[PDB]
């Protein structure tokens, strides 16, 4: 059929996409962390 190779690749791009997805969750976590670090430098003026 050659849709034989079309189906393997779909599946692929959705993997690529779900990794990106999860990678994004690691980008946002880094914010909650950068924010809690930009704030600790404020309370502790030293």
């Amino acid at each position: 059929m050659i849709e034989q190779q079309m189906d393997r690749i779909v599946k692929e791009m959705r993997r690529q996409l779900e990794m990106i997805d999860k990678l994004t969750t690691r980008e946002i976590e880094q914010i909650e962390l950068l924010k809690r670090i930009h704030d600790n430098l404020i309370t502790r003026p030293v």
Copy 2:
């Protein structure tokens, strides 16, 4: 058939690239935080 399959590809190419606009948004959030932290460093 083959044509039908290529669209899924197109939608997956848009739902992917779509995902990246979103990610580049976080990247910009971090950079502003970084700068906010650096200025709060010049002082102490």
Copy 3:
């Protein structure tokens, strides 16, 4: 309209790719401030 459906793919592989550029364009800004942030090693 199949060879033509690819003409959109090429349009978008190039669109996406031009967006993965900005994400990279930004990655460097972060890596820059971190350099300035580093320096106040003794201050």
Copy 4:
């Protein structure tokens, strides 16, 4: 053969994933280096 070029696409695609994997591995290392640093400043 055109069916054959496709194997170049699937391959090059797995060359993407095999990497987007390496990259996400780059990203977590940052989260752990930040969760740890925070906890450093947390004790002053």
Copy 5:
């Protein structure tokens, strides 16, 4: 240009394989600019 639109496509997969590859060399600069900050405690 089916078979010819084939390579133009495979091409962008190698040039896009470069963007991610580099975008990665930068991500590594961040992490060692961060460990070069964590241990700094």
